[PDB]
């Protein structure tokens, strides 16, 4: 339920956020707080940070 994929490339503007390429995969770590962003770990880089929900979808969708 926590394995997601980037639908688009993204370049971050806040240092709390991940930059990523289309097709990169993530484990979602925390989606409880309200906001456009969930905390995730990139499976490509091992870095942890926010990703925008509207750039990503489950791997099986």
């Amino acid at each position: 339920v926590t394995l997601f994929v980037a639908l688009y490339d993204y370049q971050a503007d806040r240092w709390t956020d991940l930059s990523f390429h289309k097709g990169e995969k993530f484990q979602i770590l925390d989606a409880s707080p309200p906001g456009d962003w969930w905390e995730a770990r990139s499976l490509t880089t091992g870095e942890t940070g926010y990703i925008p929900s509207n750039y990503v979808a489950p791997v099986d969708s």
């Binding site: 709390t16 770590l29 456009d36 091992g46």
Partner: protein, 226 residues
């Protein structure tokens, strides 16, 4: 910390180095500061499944006798924290045990709600974060002096709110808190006024700090009940 200097070892004895784990994958690191023998203040966005705090450190890679490494037993993230605005980027951490007060490990006074700090004054922040966009984190605790800016200087941060947030760092200089410094205190004339929250990915100042004075009631509520 970008453009800072190495701290005199143990000269900021309230500083806490946080290592944050979520199952199997690599950890992340933040700053924080000791405000009671068993409570550390940090940023909400530093939350994770489990957290270890190291007190009494200078070089975080070299264990020493001044170290008190304590597990966090409860996290109190601000209930209004929101990831779009990063408003209320504040969290209290209850430690498994009370730290021993030594020269190298001590608490930092936090402000009354009235003590509201104004633009133009110089403040100091410390941390173990990156020393540049493409640079390593610092093994040693670093500090830098930064100018408190008018809120307009932070107009490009989403819904910047001067009641909740401080705007920190002259944009004409490169000096700044940066990645890995989140959760660290901002001190103005020796008094804790801010917590490093976030800033630009490209390290261009100013950065956004949580304004501690606004949160004194919430901090009191957590400390009184725990």
């Amino acid at each position: 910390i970008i453009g800072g200097t190495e701290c005199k070892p143990h000269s900021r004895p309230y500083m806490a180095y946080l290592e944050i784990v979520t199952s199997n994958g690599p950890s992340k690191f933040c700053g924080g500061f000791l405000i009671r023998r068993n409570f550390v203040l940090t940023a909400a966005h530093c939350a994770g499944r489990s957290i270890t705090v190291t007190l009494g450190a200078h070089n975080i890679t070299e264990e020493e006798d001044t170290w008190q490494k304590l597990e966090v037993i409860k996290q109190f993230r601000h209930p209004k924290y929101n990831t779009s605005t990063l408003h209320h980027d504040i969290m209290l951490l209850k430690l498994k045990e009370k730290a021993s007060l030594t020269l190298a490990v001590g608490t930092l006074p936090f402000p009354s709600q009235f003590n509201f700090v104004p633009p133009g004054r110089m403040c100091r922040v410390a941390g173990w974060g990156r020393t540049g966009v493409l640079k390593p984190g610092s093994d040693t605790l670093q500090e830098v002096k930064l100018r408190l800016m008018d809120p307009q200087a932070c107009s490009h941060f989403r819904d910047f709110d001067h009641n909740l947030q401080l705007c920190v760092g002259n944009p004409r200089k490169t000096k700044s808190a940066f990645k890995g410094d989140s959760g660290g205190p901002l001190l103005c004339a020796g008094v804790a006024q801010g917590i490093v929250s976030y800033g630009r990915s490209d390290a261009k100042p100013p950065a956004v700090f949580t304004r501690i004075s606004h949160y004194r009631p919430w901090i009191n509520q957590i400390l009184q009940a725990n």
